[PDB]
Amino acid sequence: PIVLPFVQRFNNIDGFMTLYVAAVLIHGALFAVVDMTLNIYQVQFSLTRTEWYLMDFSDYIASFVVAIIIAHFGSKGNRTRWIAASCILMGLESMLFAFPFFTYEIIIPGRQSIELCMEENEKRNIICGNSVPNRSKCIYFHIGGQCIHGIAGMPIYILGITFIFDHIPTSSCGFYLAIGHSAYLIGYLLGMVGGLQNFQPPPKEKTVEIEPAKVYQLLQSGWWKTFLIIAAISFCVSFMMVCFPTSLPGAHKLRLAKRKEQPHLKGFLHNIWHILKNPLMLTQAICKVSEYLTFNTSLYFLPHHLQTQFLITPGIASLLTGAFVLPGGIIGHFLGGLIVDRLEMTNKNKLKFTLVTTVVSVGLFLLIFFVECQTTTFAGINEDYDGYGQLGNLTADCNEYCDCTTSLYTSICGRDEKEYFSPCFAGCKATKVSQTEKTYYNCSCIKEGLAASDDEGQFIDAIAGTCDSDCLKLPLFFAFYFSATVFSNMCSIPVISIILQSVPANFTSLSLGVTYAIVKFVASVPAPLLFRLSSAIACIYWDNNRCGGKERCWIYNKNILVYEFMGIWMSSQLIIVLLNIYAIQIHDVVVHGEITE
Amino acid sequence: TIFAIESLGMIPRSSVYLVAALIFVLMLTFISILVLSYFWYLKIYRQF
Amino acid sequence: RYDVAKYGCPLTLELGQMFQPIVELYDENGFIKIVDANFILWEIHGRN
């Protein structure tokens, strides 16, 4: 008996769009939290990188195997019911991911393993690996969570854009696509910010070795809070959207205005035949594949590039790459949508516009390479430690005294402008710590040094972290990355607008699924293998003494990595340019044939 | 007799590239605004 | 190489200030008187 004007306004198209923005925002937040949660889980819980790759590919293959089936299901049934079911499965997924971080928080603690480790011994706390037991259950939980996450998240990005395509005019389709992409982007930002504001240790960062144990407790506690909050929000959104009627009044009015003036396997095969016969769709699909490949490569590579070239600490480098890939991206998406919406862009003009954007992006990438051709301060790789020992003298008496592990070696900076790996191996057996800075005392394995330094209460103080004297190229590179992100995010909206034009209204549901299958299978499966091959080509000097099977390198060759990644990016962009220059002629031929003026 | 003086000066960081980043952000935004106005006038010159 | 056993504790002077090198005479038990003479200052190594 709800005949309220609140309902009569909530069934409007803007009412649907508000909850779609909220759902895309919470999906982006959950995905951004989940990715770095899996990364820190793999870093902390004593596993190998191949398993991280496996449970990262599990989400992608689940999305691939759910996309076509959910497009086929929504092509015949109500999209709202499937969206609500996906949101319900999403809310279940968030709690299923939260459960291991609260039930199984005693897998690998600092000292809480009282059965096989004792407090008075330091060596016995890092051996007798009972953490490997009760970890396979967590692996099963995480792989199931990734599977249900893909199965519950994909249909959304399919059916919401299907709703936009089938019940919004093209004058606002670009705006809705742009604000949906911006909602996903700001969800990524907000999720990473909430994750990194709690996973990072409190201002008591530099206390005694109960600090890793309390950080280990705190990060799982924070994930347990955040995932239940996300699950409650998703369940509330699902329940609110369930109350929405199937027959939308605004959609029915639009259909009545536009009326004037069985998905069978054979129909599926005919549709695939039409898709393969029209080469515009193939060109746009490969262009989207290359754009996604370039975006993912840049996102995965920029923090590592900052560590190896600008000496940017991992989390700070990832924070920089995140927090400065969004302001360009959201503005580019908004501009790309708004240009088409305000100016009523045509298909040939869209192709020319995308070609111009890709050309200027290629020029900007060339400028980025030219800037990277400049030199910078070099840390390490000084062709053996000044003649005292070889590459492999890191396991000295100074290393053996304080019991350092090679998997967490940081960079110290002496006062003679020489940077040394393993600050504890640098000879410093005393560590007195200030409130805002880490430093090392009484260093004996170090060189002469002691040039200037600075202290008040003592002396012989080696500061922690990587010292930098010429880091002014970073803001320039960040501005160039702003421009590159703008022109990369601004290319995608005209492609989707092109995709809308060539497909009739009744079949517009399956086009998004067809494109998204190539997005997640053809592009997303071999790209990490290619990235690992390039990374193995670059990181020749692996830690073969202890680390073994290529788990942690130390010498990341800046010139080789820059040259290879820029060659890959230039090849992808030139492939996009060639596809666009083919598609311009193809679309001109098709238009001339269909017009025959 | 001996004595050594260490007096602080005012040699700061140049920050020339740090502000050249702002220069590049600015004229890229100006070029984008000019391109938007360019496309708008390409839409609206056919009336005349 | 600077040190303290041969060069003494150095000054820690802040941004540009005014200093007069004023020296007094001392022997055996203690100081005798303030020194009024003609002075010359020279750096250890050489600057301009």
Add this chain to the structure above:
Amino acid sequence: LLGLQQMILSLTQSLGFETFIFIVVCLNTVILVAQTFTELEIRGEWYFMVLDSIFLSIYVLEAVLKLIALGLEYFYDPWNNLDFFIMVMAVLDFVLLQINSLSYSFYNHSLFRILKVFKSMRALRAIRVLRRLSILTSLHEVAGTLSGSLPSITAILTLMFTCLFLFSVVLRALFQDSDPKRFQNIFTTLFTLFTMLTLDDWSLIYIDNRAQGAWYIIPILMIYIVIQYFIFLNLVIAVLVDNFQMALLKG
């Protein structure tokens, strides 16, 4: 009590504003000119500020009556806007003195200076409202013929402002590390350019700048002085002379 109250207020406002306001403002002016008067305040200082508070209470009663009066057209009068502003600062400083306690400096402070200059435009507004009668037609016509050419003199003062600001910028720029101690900041700069514009010891500026190592700054100051002097003074003199000259040509 709407329009009927407004018309009752109009009639009784005419009557009581002619009767009560004139005598109380005359007494306020008498006590204020006996107050300023820095020889009789020591023959006082206790019978003075009590009468100030009493007549400020009378003035805030005038403000209350004007607020309860017709409103918008009362606000439309610029003099009444000045009255409202003066009553705002009057209630502000009255409650500031009334609350006591506080945490800032006192005992004849800069805020107290601001307060007694506040009482100075209070006295000025009392003088302005006491001259409702017998303004004298000769000086009334003289003042009207003064105010006839407002746009010309405003344009000329805008020009002189732009020219002084340009001269201040160029002289502060050319005088860098040339003993700025007289004009180290913008205020003292523009004050030195005011002295240069008002013929005040710029010959002394020349003689104590010859003691410095800069000599070419003296011809620059020289030509700037003479051009701004002749141009501005001649423009204002000519404009006001002709403005009264059409009035002379008329009746």
Add this chain to the structure above:
Amino acid sequence: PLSLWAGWVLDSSVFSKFIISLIFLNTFVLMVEIELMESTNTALWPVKLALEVADWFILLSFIVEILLMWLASFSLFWKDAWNVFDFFVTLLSLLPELVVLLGVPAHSVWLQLLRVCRVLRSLKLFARFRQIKVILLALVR
């Protein structure tokens, strides 16, 4: 384009409002930077550098303004009315960038004369009123 573009950007009120806003913002900012160039406010030092570089951006806006002037009659504009004086003043205001990029201004820089030249050009290109114009015509005759 070209001359048509110059006419359109002169006719549009948004461009005129933007350029006059930049003009008076630059004139207001110009005297701020000369007041303090020390470590009195550490947090206000990078933003003051950014304000000086915003003035450099105003010089780049003058560069694109003379590009719009190149879009006009080009060689005919080399000998004209006070607009050619404005062009010369903008060139003299672009000159300090060159003399700090390659001149090493530890000498008689004379940057201040060009600065006051561009300041007076901004103070004259401020959409002067008709009351100013009539008295200026009286002064020139």
